[PDB]
Amino acid sequence: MRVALTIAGSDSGGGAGVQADLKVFFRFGVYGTSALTLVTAQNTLGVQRVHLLPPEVVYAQIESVAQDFPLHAAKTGALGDAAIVEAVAEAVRRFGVRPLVVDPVMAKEAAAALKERLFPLADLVTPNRLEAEALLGRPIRTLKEAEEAAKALLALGPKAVLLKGGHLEAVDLLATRGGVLRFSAPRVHTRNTHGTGCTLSAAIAALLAKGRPLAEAVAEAKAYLTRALKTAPSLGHGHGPLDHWA
Amino acid sequence: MRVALTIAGSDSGGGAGVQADLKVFFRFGVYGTSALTLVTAQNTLGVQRVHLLPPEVVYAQIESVAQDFPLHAAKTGALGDAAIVEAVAEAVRRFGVRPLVVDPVMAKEAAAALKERLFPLADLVTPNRLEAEALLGRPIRTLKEAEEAAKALLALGPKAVLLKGGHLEAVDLLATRGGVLRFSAPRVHTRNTHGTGCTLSAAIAALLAKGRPLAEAVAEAKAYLTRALKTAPSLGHGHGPLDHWA
């Protein structure tokens, strides 16, 4: 049995955060472990309250898991603040947590720590066009401009970059030192969109843990997301969660 | 789709706490929501560090979930301290969280708050013989003495009591105002015992959420636990987790 770790925030509503990550790991037959960075009171209407955890507590969880279980893959989600990002980077380096999927899920300072401390340790970064623009500063509005963006983020240290929605049906770009690839996915419209990015990065981590090559992990993860979106349940009053059983 | 809520602690190792509860909810086709009470750095060797959450943060999570999702059942696990127990009881009462499965998972003060504030709101309490003795103070060493214990706890307010391991193959007693029942389960021996009680209370909550009567929920939950124990994976260096996929 393969094991995966998620270093992210807690979403009480269960649609994103570690709740979604663990459901995905479980669906994919992967044993899930988790290092919480923060705790939120949250539902389908949004976040009502946030409680950041002490950086040392986040580090301790990673240490406890990393030294007892073999980690075949891991992902990072919401990191709260710069101090936490730094503790996470130190832990990831110290315990050799790889391959690592860093899902931006974006404070000015936190973004800086993320790019400088964590990106260099990533096997893959999964920013959306917006996040990509934020990280790089430059604007993105065309496929060619998106590809340059992907390559630009690659220079920050990650071994691969998945810029989502690089061009709008909706195409994502996977950039590696070898070249750029393009993935196409049905722009399925629905209200149940909460946890889309989270579910994607979790599925990729799960697939990597099972031995799938990166490009194939991303394609299978996207195929899973599409199914998850199509049969999303009618739960919550706002943007409902995905159908992780899909 | 039915929804269930777990109000408990976070176990980074994934074998117990909300991690185990959510895996069980998912296995049973129930949508999981969670209100974290505390966060632990933990593995198969035990707990390395504990971080209690502010009582108001625990309350906020329950409120966020309860007002947005219909709750068909819920359970409580580790509650940290008296202040948290009290906030949980207030929330459970205020938002009408029922049916509620209170799993003791036992400070002198916290135990008092649990018994006085939370037990009266429980549809079922699942203490083990030890916990039962602690709560009542009296000693338990015989079946007849165990049955009296079960009935004794029933007088504290809960609508039903499942005293585990009341008599040692291993028999559990389910006491209600109507009478006492006895469940027998194979005393399966294995190192992977981490999260046994947690997995049981979570399965009961999940079954109640799907409309199963109490007695039947307990029997099916126990049947699930037995399977979970039999094929437990070889993960961790100490007492490994159960096979929740069972």
From TrEMBL, chains A, B:
Alphabetical list of SUPFAM superfamilies matching this protein: Ribokinase-like
GO molecular function: ATP binding; hydroxymethylpyrimidine kinase activity; phosphomethylpyrimidine kinase activity
Taxonomy, superkingdom: Bacteria
Keywords on record: ATP-binding, Kinase, Nucleotide-binding, Transferase
Pfam families: Phos_pyr_kin
Record flagged with keyword Nucleotide-binding: yes
Enzyme class, spelled out: transferase
Pathway: Cofactor biosynthesis; thiamine diphosphate biosynthesis
Gene Ontology cellular component terms for the protein in this record: cytosol
EC numbers: 2.7.1.49
All residue ranges annotated as the Rhodanese domain in the record: 146-176
One GO-annotated biological process of the protein: thiamine biosynthetic process
PANTHER family reported in the protein's UniProt record: HYDROXYMETHYLPYRIMIDINE_PHOSPHOMETHYLPYRIMIDINE KINASE THI20-RELATED, PHOSPHOMETHYLPYRIMIDINE KINASE
Protein name listed in UniProt: hydroxymethylpyrimidine kinase
Organism for this UniProt entry: Thermus thermophilus
High-level lineage: Bacteria, Thermotogati, Deinococcota, Deinococci, Thermales
